[PDB]
Assembly symmetry: C4
């Protein structure tokens, strides 16, 4: 068997974190990324697992995740470095049969631990599993520059923020018809911010943390990365437009309605009504 | 002989899509690219073709393209990934003898299909073939960031937009003397927007889709990429200038006239008249 | 024994300088970087040392640095070229037993000398050694674009500047709770600016040189680079926000206090009091 | 003997053009670069020369360049492509004994010719040879984005423009104490614009072409690239500052005078007097 570092999921984690680094979204240890796998993905690589996997409790019981393996970024690790030493910067964890904690099956070497935003990640996976009938498998957080800047100048309201982001690139309503949930500012690395994010994830695939960054959910690494890249691209356009004095013209409600009809998506009602 | 992946046209498609990705013009699956080939280009590579080429109808009859091969980007495919798996992200199609449809001779694996903007592409090829006596061979669409931003702040008028872009870098009048056609906002992925784009291509090598992006035409991948890159560079300069309060001075009509005379190009009259 | 160019410390210097070059922080010979080593790091590579190591006096006696080796960037050398020829662009120097000067043991070929900001570097090492009980080992200077821009539009005051940078990305208060010291503009390459920077390093891990750039200190190359990248990322966000007409909402004092208490850090009092 | 493509000068031309491409300064065929060589540089590589070197006249006699070889970028060639095929995109030319014309000894394949800005280049080399006692060997033109943007908003005046660029990064007065000469807009690719540039090069190492770009001169590729990168970095800072409402504070005349004193340079009097 090829080494686990050559697997699609390890290579995918390297590509996504490295790409995010090059985008300027992941200074220092900013950002974190978790991908839900199946047993069948990791089973063939069992020979590469730790001889005595470390056990760490979860922040709270998560029985929906019982027996579920994930590949995750490590706490304090730099996205820039993942490509240089995957086992030091990433790991595979498997939640136990009670959903009480997990074993570190591979990686997170040298006493590394999973991201300190694990509550936000795993609680959000739970809500997205329920919301998408098990389709979504990735939660990604990064410090997307223009989205962050917009949280200082736009009303921090789901409808307003969704509507502006839809306007800032035509594809946006098709890529995120459910819109972008916006939380109040909250203290990072807490179960509060984690659960608040998970609750927003019931209704949206994107959640903004004002003055901080973004969370996205999707079925694959590429589709989740691309979801965030789309919102951030729209944000980039908007920052330019606002810097030039604002919109002289823009995508109208009628045009958004026609767009939704053509692509068979139902646009978030509150954002459309503006 | 050598694999078709090493051919000039597959390598060229990889270079253009990868470069556009690095420019930040092609988030997610944004953008599409088609290059018209000759039979002689692809004939040596017949052993790399699909054993049983799939047939797909065109959106409408295109008899001018009868028997014509193209290399195209696939629908939903990411420009970022083309370099990683050319056959998964690109395909070679050959239009049948009636211009009714095409066979997928190579690539577009796992049941992929050509870009959903194929009407805009192939109808534009038809009009550019007629306009340039068969010299043009490429249609490129991307989400050129600054060009998109300008569509929210400048009058969406061909004369006005052309004139500002000529002003934003001296070379522009020489690179696109016919100017930049601007459509109204339209629903993507329709034959209406495809047909409207092709009409504009009768008179211009560049066409803007407000709040969305750009289409360019040219004889080679590099010339078409360079055409868009030139307009987008000018847009980048303009966004900076407008953000700094606007033009204190600029390229004058007299200077544009002298420039056109020196390089033997006839500047779009409506843009010059402003 | 492998060549010293393959050592962890030469490779680390290459990574940091190359990464900073890619960030746009190190045009021409802008920036300088020094890393304090142990004798045991360089001892195995003694065969690579110059046959007759050149002696250069220090600008002033630095007895705390007696017998201490450093790897340093050379004066006038381009960060862009470090990866191409480490020995031409970097050097290993060892301070003599009375802290009066150093020998150039390796590199700085063709009569190159250490950075002309050596006083700023070595005097800051001395103060950081005292301040951190020997934990800090790196001093990094670069021309961080957005931090530079902010020095023309924000009050050049430690409290004000620190508070804005904390506001521009949530993590900042946790990454630099001691804040950012701001000096007046001073003539580069002098012991005055070096000594002034070192004094500020008694109280902060980041120091700004108005209309010029930044200095950072940390235990490792990555930690120091990451410190600067965090401050510069916040600056980038702030430049966008200010360009869009300023902060409509932002991180509050209350929130900053809550953040400090969650992460067990004491925020700089003066910046918190604003 | 190795292929001439592996020579220091071909490799140098690849590095400079590729780096300028990555900076966003050389869309399409924007920019041009010429490096003066010695006979001894190219003599070893005669087997790589063309069977029958093409002769092309110079635009006017340049006796100072009699018998002088250069490596040059080709007309209409893309900086982006120089790394992919040096011979297609670059050429080695040797000026004849009269200074009346040159032979294309290597490269510029498929009937390519030297840059259409050859008058600006070769006339500028002549003036810089005289101005520097033969030290300068490189003339570089590129479309430096922020410098271009500033020409729409700052007075296009040597003193004013020099003074702002000095203010926008502390090092600038030391890197270009003679300042930046600003021409009026002129028609590209003419001996008029070429000689006007060469005359400005008598007094300055940087010359600006409003609404177009920059020319720089220096002893080596790196020093000339670095000169331009420094001015463009300052321009980048200024564009941010001006976009944020302008300078609240800046480098003073007193400070510029002190800087010039320290580094033994004589600042351009007109720029200092402002
Ligand atoms: Zn975060
Ligand atoms: Zn599109
Ligand atoms: Zn400096
Ligand atoms: Zn030019």
């Amino acid at each position: 068997m090829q080494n686990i570092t050559q697997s699609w999921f390890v290579q995918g984690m390297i590509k996504a974190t490295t790409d995010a680094w090059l985008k300027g979204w992941d200074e220092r240890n900013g950002g974190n990324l978790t991908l839900r796998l199946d047993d069948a993905d990791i089973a063939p690589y069992h020979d590469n697992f730790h001889q005595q996997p470390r056990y760490i409790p979860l922040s709270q019981p998560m029985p929906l995740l019982a027996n579920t393996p994930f590949i995750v970024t490590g706490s304090g690790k730099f996205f820039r470095n993942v490509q240089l030493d995957p086992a030091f910067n990433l790991g595979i964890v498997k939640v136990d049969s009670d959903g009480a904690g997990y074993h570190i099956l591979w990686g997170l070497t040298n006493e590394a631990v999973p991201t300190s935003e694990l509550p936000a990640h795993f609680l959000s996976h739970c809500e997205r599993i329920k919301a998408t009938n098990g389709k979504d498998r990735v939660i990604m957080h990064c410090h997307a520059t223009n989205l962050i800047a917009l949280t200082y100048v736009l009303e921090n309201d789901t409808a307003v923020f969704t509507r502006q982001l839809w306007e800032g690139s035509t594809e946006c309503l098709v890529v995120f018809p459910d819109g972008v949930g916006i939380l109040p500012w909250m203290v990072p690395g807490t179960d509060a911010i984690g659960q608040a994010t998970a609750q927003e994830m019931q209704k949206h695939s994107l959640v903004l943390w004002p003055f901080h960054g973004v969370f996205g959910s999707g079925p694959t690494l590429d589709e989740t990365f691309g979801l965030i890249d789309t919102a951030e691209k729209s944000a980039q356009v908007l920052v330019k437009v606002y810097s030039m004095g604002g919109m002289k013209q823009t995508i109208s409600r009628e045009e958004l309605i026609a767009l939704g009809k053509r692509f068979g998506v139902t646009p978030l009602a509150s954002a459309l009504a503006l």
